[PDB]
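Teaching assistant here, posting this on the class forum so everyone can see the example we discussed in section. The complex has two components, and the goal was to see what a joint structure prediction looks like when all of them are supplied at once.
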Amino acid sequence: SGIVPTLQNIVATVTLGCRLDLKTVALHARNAEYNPKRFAAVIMRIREPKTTALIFASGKMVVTGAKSEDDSKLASRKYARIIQKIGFAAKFTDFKIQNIVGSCDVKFPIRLEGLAFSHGTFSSYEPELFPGLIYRMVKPKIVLLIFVSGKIVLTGAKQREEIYQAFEAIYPVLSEFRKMSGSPRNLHLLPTTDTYLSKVSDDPDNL
DNA sequence: TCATATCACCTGCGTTTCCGTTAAACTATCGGTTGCGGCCATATCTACCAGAAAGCACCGTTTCCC
């Protein structure tokens, strides 16, 4: 419970309001990869923040590799500004984080068979083609990947607090699977997602 | 470089289920052609009928007879 989870990847999307010519967009970006022989879209990485991004002719975009809530909106706004420099209106709309990926380490090894046998209502553990166990948390809804080393991965979340709540909910379970710190201090010590996102310009006129 | 989880996608392959196709035995009329019979025309035979010249009966004035 003392080893607070770290975010590894935040993935988001934004609507542009207007349908646009993706070939025209592909002409001016300083990083771009695109070939209709394999896929009909441009892959578009940037230096700072270190995000990858994607654009669709229908007037929608996706952003990946964000380290913070801030990076997600700030990168999306900078990609939209590049499209506004180009011959399109690109009205920044529908900003959302569809998935969050985080990880933590309890520093003790886990008997995945014991976890799967006792919590089989939520746990799945297939024959060992892959070494890690998977867990389906239903309230709040989170997917957790459990490894024998004590390393843990969390995904399927969209709100920051639920990743820390899911870790805190399974830490007592993991701690029971032991043989021969445990205090969270608070459920969420850091500021909320909204108090982070509000540092970035929200108004679409603030290009 | 293979072995899991999760999401945007969109475009693509070629899949996967009830309907459509070529053509069946058995089905429901309905048509090109078969044979079978009414109305109406004709020359002849007939039923129902009246009219004439002639019958014939009811009747009583006559007169001969009770």
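For the discussion questions: Residues 11-13, 39-41, 54, 56, 58, 60, 62, 64, 98-99, 101, 126, 128-132, 134, 143-145, 153, 155-156 of chain A lie near DNA strand B (CB under 10 Å from a C1'). DSSP finds five helices and ten strands in chain A. Think about how each of these relates to the inputs above.
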